[PDB]
Amino acid sequence: VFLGFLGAAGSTMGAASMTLTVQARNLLSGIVQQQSNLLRAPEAQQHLLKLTVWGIKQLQARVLAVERYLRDQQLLGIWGCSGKLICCTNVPWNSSWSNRNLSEIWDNMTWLQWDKEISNYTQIIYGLLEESQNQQEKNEQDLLALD
């Protein structure tokens, strides 16, 4: 079931992982409400300057929405999994990062309070993702070619 944009914000990590295509298409293709910026046929002079001063403020939010989108899509290409909305990266979950056990996480926690606990360690979890992919692409695949 699709509840609309952000509808699974209060559900569990287990029950909100059904709805990942909603916050992806409304992260870019909610811009269909902004393509009206090709306005109606304007009249003569007298506020020809007001037409372009407010034209940039409409276009900074168009360009800024695009070039914050690509750098988070590219980062999945560094880790080895581009395109896929679910990928698996083969990096061992160090037990100093977090806690309990696998099963009280997906059943009675939400993603918001989960993001709080693991935000403190996110720059070191992103550090091992670009290292277990580089070891595979330049070492393993060119060795399993010739051998």
């Binding site: 090709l38 046929a41 003569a44 002079q45 020809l48």
Partner: protein
């Protein structure tokens, strides 16, 4: 049959669309060339190699009477003039009282008037007497005698900058990415319905923006015969577009010689006016050859009769009223604005069976109001020296009278004032389409689990 969807991206299909195109003018160095209002800060240098990829088997429906390229060309033309004339000097001091008089001592039929007025020197507390030579169309009477300009009530006459240049320069209309323009190549295309020969084009050919009435100058020619072209032919209020296969030449001149004064207005802003007639007073005129004009009407009558009847009588009258913009033939040549009397061309009957040129008298005025906007007017500075022009006539804009009588005598008159007939007679073979890349089709492929 048990089949499975496959997905194809890049498939050559279209939908009709509406968009805003690229100005795309031609360009050179222009290191000493004066800023030119038609291009400059609007256009980008042109792809030097258009590729006309001829399509096979494609048959598309065009319509020149609902096109948007004509409807936005008329909007850009107003916006190209209205954005260039922001910096230009206003002629607000010249709304004063003029002590004028005749120029000649013996009246035969006068044209110019010789005036006198006050004008500020450098220091703006001292006043001096200055004169000029205004045409009589641009001067009206208040009550020895005392005159004034034609529009001191409502309008602010903005003097067109002297560093400017208005001139036909070919604009190429281009489509941005995701859009394409389609060109008809059928030689019998009257303007609607299917075109069995279509080819995609990046950018159209270079049309030369010339603003004229009753006659289409420096246009594009036909291919085999004369092409008569209208919307609802039996409707009177619709204009009749005529297009020639061979150009009809014209020769125009202003045979009197003039110079320029330099009457200043303010610090850094001067004003140009007419100073002296160095020579002799002569009327400006235009020549059309007669044996070429009488044969070019031998074709327009021939294919009018396929729309009305063989045994009919086709006549040409001249006009029935209006302003100078729609009773006469307007130009824009050499920097001045000519309004020639064309009651000598459109005058003949047709009954279904060398070097002598037709002279056309011609008026001149220098305070024009184009598109008749409320309280706005322009001014053209005088050109130093005599003016010479050569042009071709490729087409007419007729109109049909049609009251309810029983006679077998049609009468066709030239028509004027709507600029969309100048542009719709050139961009008729085009249509903009959209390119939709995704598509689905059944096959036997099966993702392989």
């Amino acid at each position: 049959e048990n089949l499975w969807v496959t997905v194809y991206y890049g498939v050559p299909v279209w939908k009709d669309a509406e968009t805003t195109l690229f100005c795309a003018s031609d360009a050179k160095a222009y290191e000493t060339e004066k800023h030119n209002i038609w291009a400059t800060h609007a256009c980008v240098p042109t792809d030097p190699n258009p590729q006309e990829i001829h399509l096979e088997n494609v048959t598309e429906e065009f319509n020149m009477w609902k096109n948007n390229m004509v409807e936005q060309m008329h909007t850009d033309i107003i916006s190209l003039w209205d954005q260039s004339l922001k910096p230009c000097v206003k002629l607000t001091p010249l709304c004063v009282t003029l002590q004028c008089t005749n120029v000649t001592n013996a009246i035969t039929d006068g044209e110019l008037k010789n005036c006198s007025f006050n004008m500020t020197t450098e220091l703006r507390d001292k006043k001096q007497k200055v004169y000029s030579l205004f045409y009589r169309l641009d001067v009206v009477q208040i009550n020895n005698k005392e005159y004034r300009l034609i529009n001191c009530n409502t309008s602010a006459i903005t003097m067109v900058c002297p560093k400017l240049s208005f001139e036909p320069i070919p604009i190429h209309y281009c489509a941005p990415a995701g859009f394409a323009i389609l060109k008809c190549k059928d030689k019998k295309f009257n303007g609607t319905g299917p075109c069995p020969s279509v080819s995609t084009v990046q950018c159209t050919h270079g049309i030369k923006p010339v603003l004229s009435t009753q006659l289409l100058l420096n246009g594009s020619l036909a291919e085999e015969e004369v092409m008569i072209r209208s919307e609802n032919i039996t409707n009177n209020a619709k204009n009749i577009l005529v297009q020639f296969n061979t150009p009809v030449q014209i020769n125009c001149t202003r045979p009197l010689n003039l110079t320029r004064k330099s009457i200043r207005i303010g610090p850094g802003q001067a004003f140009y006016a007419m100073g002296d007639i160095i020579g002799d007073i002569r009327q400006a005129h235009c020549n059309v050859s007669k044996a070429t004009w009488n044969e070019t009407l031998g074709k327009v009558v021939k294919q009018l009769r396929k729309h009305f009847g063989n045994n009919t009588i086709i006549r040409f009258a001249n006009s029935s009223g209006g302003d100078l913009e729609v009773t006469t033939h307007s130009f824009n040549c050499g920097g001045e604005f000519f309004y020639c009397n064309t009651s000598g061309l459109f005058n003949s009957t047709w009954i279904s069976n060398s070097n002598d040129s037709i002279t056309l008298p011609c008026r001149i005025k220098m305070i024009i109001n184009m598109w008749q906007r409320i309280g706005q007017a322009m001014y053209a500075p005088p050109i130093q020296g005599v003016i010479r022009c050569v042009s071709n006539i490729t087409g007419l804009i007729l109109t049909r009278d049609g009251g309810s009588t029983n006679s077998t005598t049609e009468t066709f008159r030239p028509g004027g004032g709507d600029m969309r007939d100048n542009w719709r007679s050139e961009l008729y073979k085009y249509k903009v389409v959209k390119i939709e890349p995704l598509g689905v089709a059944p096959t036997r492929c099966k993702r392989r689990v």
